Design a binder for these strands. Structure first.
Lengths: 143, 128, 109, 118, 131
DNA sequence: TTTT
DNA sequence: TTTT
């Protein structure tokens, strides 16, 4: 018997009961499709396997995909638009990382300091999700 | 299969209420919202609603109350504060493409709600 | 049922069950008498009608009133003293009584 | 009929059931002895009556005597003609930094029986 | 009958039921092994006795060890990597990462570091080790 | 449905 | 099949 705390699309603080733990993600999906979110966006965005990027179920984190005119695939999340960006592989010693897909947006004046991120060569940003390495998990994909 | 909604009452108390099903969730928010109870915070920039929901928006949904003076002055009360209604024309400039809007704000400066674009959603309206 | 969250006089975070909504204020008065508070003081202070000041039930916000026989009215809340319609101190007001329409349930019963 | 939210010695956010309002301070002592705390230390430290400094049950606020340890910090007894405090570390916020940081200050009031060791 | 609030591996705010207080650590290890965390890292990082360092149960705090391809011992916690640092004089072992613009000033230690945990002094507690 |  |  689990409980999960949500923030509705109206910003209301709501708690749902979950009969069995195994149903947790399906419940996040169910309320996430309505724009409901649980928790804050993790430091540097949610981190997922690269192989989950192309068919990721954005409703899992209360987000949705929208394709703009002039052909551009955006992610909307709590009233913010996030853009799909490429991150190059990292190469040095001692850190080697494969390339990544980053969904992110400019930091606005109303963004608190703990959600901001800064890398050299560009201005600060706020990241929603980073798809890098790992191994595909079916639970992240649209059913 | 019950839900719970956490409110801040008119006395600022932190109070939690039970809800039978997600169906009657908006009913409960209307109910306590008519009492001036609120749940959660005002998002930076104000709540964002469709322009077509403005005329008959249910202010109790966010614990607000709309008042209209004999002279037709529209004010909204929310957590003891008065917010005024302003109509904003569309903007087309080098950085902006903003459709027309109605905004409720006060001015410490703060915006409570902005009605702009989007599609009308029936659930936001005063029922009946 | 309902629940109400308090900070006790010792800082403890305690949640009290309430069997029926009609008695919420009574529960607030009960723990309010002990110096327990629920939630935070709104920025600018609480806002109450000016017509409620005289016999406002300070226990509702976990406060108590103090009147000196010398003629001084004070309000104690979370160990701070708010001089006296606005009740404020020097760090900030606790509550302001101005305008509005008088509400019966606020008054000391 | 009552619940209390603790931060355990490991930092876990844990909620405990309590029989009646009268059993509250004891539940606080019980978990306090394990170093669990409930809520925050108020600005300037907690406030207690000077006559309670004698037999004060430190377990009430998750503290222990060795000095007095609370959330892994050591506070020392100081006489002022009894405040407990410690020098401010580099990991302490600008708030609470009074630089020093106080846990408890004993001044005035009437000796409450509930505050002392039973 | 205790309850513990977790932040899951997906960021969800979730509350779990625990039968007896005695079984609490076992519940923390269980979900901690999936990356679930409870509460925040205290400033300066968790404090443990140095005799618990060698076989500390990292799952207790939602963490896991990993030896990277550069052969450096990491602890992964909430997506972040913390490096092991042997310090000598009071000697201690720190698990630290580089500070970021999102890290408040009081969390930083001085290049600026932020520590997950610190093993120093104290007396070895068996509950902290891998069962 | 929506889409900074 | 892992992170700055």
């Amino acid at each position: 018997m689990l409980q999960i705390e949500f923030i509705t699309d109206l910003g209301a603080r709501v708690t749902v009961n979950v009969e069995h733990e195994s149903r947790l993600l399906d419940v996040q999906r169910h309320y996430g499709r309505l724009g409901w979110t649980s928790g804050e966006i993790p430091s540097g965005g949610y981190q997922f396997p690269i192989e989950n990027e192309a068919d990721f179920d954005w409703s899992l984190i209360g987000a949705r995909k929208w394709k703009s005119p002039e052909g551009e695939e955006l992610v909307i999340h709590r009233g913010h638009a996030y853009r799909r960006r490429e991150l190059e592989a990292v190469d040095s010693r001692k850190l080697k990382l494969p390339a990544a897909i980053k969904y992110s947006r400019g930091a606005k004046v109303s963004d608190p300091q703990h959600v901001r991120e800064k890398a050299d060569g560009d201005i600060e940003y706020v990241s929603l999700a980073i798809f890098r390495g790992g191994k595909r998990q079916e639970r992240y994909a649209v059913p």
